[PDB]
Amino acid sequence: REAVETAVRTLAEHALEQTSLISNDAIKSIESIIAALDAKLTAQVNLIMHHA
Amino acid sequence: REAVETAVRTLAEHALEQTSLISNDAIKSIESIIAALDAKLTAQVNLIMHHA
Numbered sequence: 001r002e003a004v005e006t007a008v009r010t011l012a013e014h015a016l017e018q019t020s021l022i023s024n025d026a027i028k029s030i031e032s033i034i035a036a037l038d039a040k041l042t043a044q045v046n047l048i049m050h051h052a
Numbered sequence: 053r054e055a056v057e058t059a060v061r062t063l064a065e066h067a068l069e070q071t072s073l074i075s076n077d078a079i080k081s082i083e084s085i086i087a088a089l090d091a092k093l094t095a096q097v098n099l100i101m102h103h104a
Contacts, residue, residue, distance in 0.1 A: 004084060004085045004087075004088045005088070007085045008085060008088045011089065012089075
């Protein structure tokens, strides 16, 4: 029933997080700042390159 | 009548469990956890292998 769910709970958790998979990941959408940084570099490099 | 049932009771039990057949088996359906463990390995390996 739910007993197998407890066995795979202890096994899956203990095996999964005990040593490997250091820090894992949670929200990687914070790296979307690179989209804003890149966007600023496009806004600036457009003006630098398109100057007379 | 039931006397032969008592004779095969003492004989069958004494012979059966006295030494051999250590621990025997009762419920082996607890090994169905391997179905859940394997199921998790399919759910994960599907994602690992099917990645771009």
